[PDB]
């Protein structure tokens, strides 16, 4: 069948971002990131992992200064 891993594997550390909201793009063809939706947020809240959720929301998506500071650190 036409479902090969060569067309499925994707990974990213830092790439292009959006314009209005400074969030990473989506899709393999654009070197985008993986969406951490509301259900994953519920799972993190149920686990009790406050810091993982906070860093995922702030310094991996939107914190413009935080992204470059984290990379430098």
């Amino acid at each position: 069948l036409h479902h090969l891993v060569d067309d499925k594997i994707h990974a990213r550390s830092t790439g292009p971002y959006s314009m209005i909201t400074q969030q990473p793009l989506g899709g393999k063809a654009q070197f985008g990131g993986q969406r951490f939706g509301e259900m994953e947020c519920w799972a993190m809240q149920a686990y009790g992992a406050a810091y993982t959720l906070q860093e995922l929301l702030t310094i991996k998506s939107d914190d413009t200064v935080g992204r470059v500071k984290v990379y430098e650190a």
């Binding site: 891993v5 060569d6 499925k8 594997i9 939706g37 259900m39 994953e40 519920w42 799972a43 993190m44 149920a46 686990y47 993982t52």
Partner: protein, 49 residues
């Protein structure tokens, strides 16, 4: 050297309960597919199809 003792979070959508996100210790493999433990499928509701 860098991935040793550095956990990674694995998630499968939809995330119905807490056990849809789980932390694992990674090991490098030569393929392009993630190797998942057979005993964590029921938590993820995952099958290899």
């Amino acid at each position: 050297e860098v991935i040793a003792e550095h956990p990674v979070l694995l998630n499968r959508a939809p995330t119905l309960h807490r056990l849809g996100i789980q932390a694992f210790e990674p090991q490098l493999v030569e393929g392009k597919a993630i190797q998942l433990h057979p005993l964590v499928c029921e938590a993820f509701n995952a099958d290899f199809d």
